[PDB]
């Protein structure tokens, strides 16, 4: 057949190298073209563009440029301002729009040609709520960073109505990474249990400023929301005795997954040296992992449909594309075992609300998996380990003198009563 063409809209760096999203999209197309056993008589072609990520008019032009040139899917401009502008284009023309980062779904938006791969926060905000009850907390102190972070954690804001918690919501400063006026108030207010809602690039900058203050001892416990906690440098924090519970969808225990990540950092030779950041070396973040899966899930759909002629569609001359109505269905009932575990989509919306998390935590050897979350099950945590040698909290001379004693009046007799004395 005429081969295919996937679209793509990514960030526009000025002097730096390619982004983590676009390079993973370029890597995933090439990898499927090598290994023939997926798509045997079909190879892929990509038509990536670059926008300003905050200008929805530029995202709307570059979407119509790919549709007029003729593409088969649009793999997301990946920002709430401009992803809603490309979603309504892909709905009008009929081509599928595959999203790889969370976006506020407006509740009365009737769209059917979008599908998301970021784990939806009507499931992650249950997993944090199951995790602040497994730890028996009563006073959490949710810290977000921008005003959208109240939409993400909204099943956790509504939680003290139905449970016994005490939310004490705070906010980081505007764009300045100086949380030290904030962390003074969290320290004076005796706030030991924090549910940071940052990205991993800025969850590193808080932990340096929480180590420069006295907020890294065994009293403080920090649940994070971000899924790139495994790619966080933790060597200064490891012996502190802190608890840093997180989550991880990037399934870095399967050897097929770990083989790709070794191929990732090898092919990514454009990884800049940056010691002042607070991150580790070049790892595949969960932003670049969900773009790697997004090419594979759609490639399952083109495997099950060898009738797909990519047509050229003009935004001015409004006409829905022919095969896209069936092709959008073949994406939604597609299953794939990608790098982020199982991929399935929720047939009502097109979101991922069924996925397999791995609860990781900070012990003195680094970040170690201590559990497993799953929306059907809950926290099936491993949860019974020894590690460090044991102690004892009881001793002798609290032995309590078993006095054998028969009953006989007046000496020993039961009390005449009605309630169950014991």
């Amino acid at each position: 057949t005429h081969v295919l063409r996937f679209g793509g809209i990514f960030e526009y760096v000025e002097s730096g190298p390619m982004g983590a999203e676009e390079l993973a999209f370029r890597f995933a197309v090439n990898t499927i073209n090598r290994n023939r056993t997926l798509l045997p008589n079909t190879t892929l072609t990509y038509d990536t563009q670059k926008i300003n990520l905050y200008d929805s008019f530029e995202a709307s032009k570059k979407a119509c440029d790919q549709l007029s040139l003729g593409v088969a899917a649009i793999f997301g401009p990946s920002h709430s301002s401009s992803a809603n502008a490309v979603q309504s284009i892909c709905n009008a023309l009929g081509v599928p729009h595959i999203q790889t980062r969370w976006k506020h779904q407006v509740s009365d938006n009737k769209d059917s040609f979008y599908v998301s791969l970021y784990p939806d926060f009507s499931s992650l905000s249950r997993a944090i709520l199951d995790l602040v009850q497994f730890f028996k907390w009563k006073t959490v102190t949710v810290v977000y960073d921008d005003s959208t972070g109240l939409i993400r954690l909204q099943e956790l804001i509504k939680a003290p109505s139905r449970y016994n918690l005490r939310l004490k919501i705070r906010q980081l400063p505007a764009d300045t990474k100086d949380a030290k006026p904030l962390l003074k108030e969290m320290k004076r207010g005796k706030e030991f249990h924090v549910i940071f809602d940052c990205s991993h690039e800025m969850a590193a900058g808080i932990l340096k400023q929480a180590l420069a203050m006295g907020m890294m001892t065994e009293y403080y416990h920090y649940i994070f929301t971000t899924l790139d906690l495994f790619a966080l440098d933790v060597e200064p924090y490891r012996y502190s005795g802190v608890n840093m519970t997180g989550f991880r969808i990037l399934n870095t225990e399967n050897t097929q997954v770990s083989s790709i990540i070794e191929k990732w950092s090898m092919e990514r030779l454009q990884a800049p040296p940056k010691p002042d950041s607070g991150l580790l070396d070049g790892f595949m973040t969960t932003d670049a992992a969900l773009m790697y899966d997004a090419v594979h899930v759609v490639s399952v759909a083109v495997q099950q449909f060898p009738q797909m002629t990519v047509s050229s569609l003009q935004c001015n001359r409004h006409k829905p594309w022919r095969f896209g109505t069936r092709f959008m269905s073949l994406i939604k009932e597609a299953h794939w075992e990608g790098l982020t575990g199982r991929i399935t989509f929720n047939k009502t919306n097109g979101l991922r609300t069924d996925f397999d998390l791995d609860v990781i935590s900070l012990k003195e050897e680094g970040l170690e998996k201590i559990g497993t979350w799953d929306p059907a099950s809950g926290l099936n945590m491993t949860e019974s380990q020894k590690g460090k040698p044991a102690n004892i909290t009881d001793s002798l001379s609290n032995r309590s003198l078993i006095v054998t004693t028969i009953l006989e009046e007046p000496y020993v007799l039961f009390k005449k009563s009605d309630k169950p004395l014991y």
Binding site: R162, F414, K415, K416, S417, D418, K419, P420, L421, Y422
Partner: protein, 210 residues
Amino acid sequence: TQCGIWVRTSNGGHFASPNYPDSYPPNKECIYILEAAPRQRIELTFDERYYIEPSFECRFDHLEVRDGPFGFSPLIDRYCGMKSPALIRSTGRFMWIKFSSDEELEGLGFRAKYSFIPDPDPDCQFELSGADGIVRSSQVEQEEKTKPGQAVDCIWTIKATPKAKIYLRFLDYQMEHSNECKRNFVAVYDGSSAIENLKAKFCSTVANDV
């Protein structure tokens, strides 16, 4: 108690909610008792018509289908909500239905269909009535309801004279293992048998006259 759909033909013990299918009034506390003549794998087939209120946890406005001829039984489910339940198998020779209601609700109720197939394959129920009678623990031994060498669990219903109240008083009361409720006790459930209206649960030495 104003639960006026019951119809009780041999198979087809077909009951529905109070004021079915219009509504049901607040503070209704119905105790569909369901005798359940020995056969037939007790069948709770419901109608699709269902507004037994979607409260949280079914904390109020619920539909106890507790598997006993009484209240303290193995519970099946508190069925409140919007979607209708269906087809409880329940191999007992009995079913207890407590339809309850709070004060500030709406409703339409439910409908129930009876009579599955299979074989009939303790059962004291000393139904006492009228004036002053005697309640004896040895009635299970005189009337062969249980045999010596097994756990006993009797029910002494004490249905009054019309327009009356009941004063229990204890002539003899002696427990084999006093001050221990997990292996013997006497409970004085009033109204009908349910865990809510438990008046007194005696397992110590002295039973006071309730």
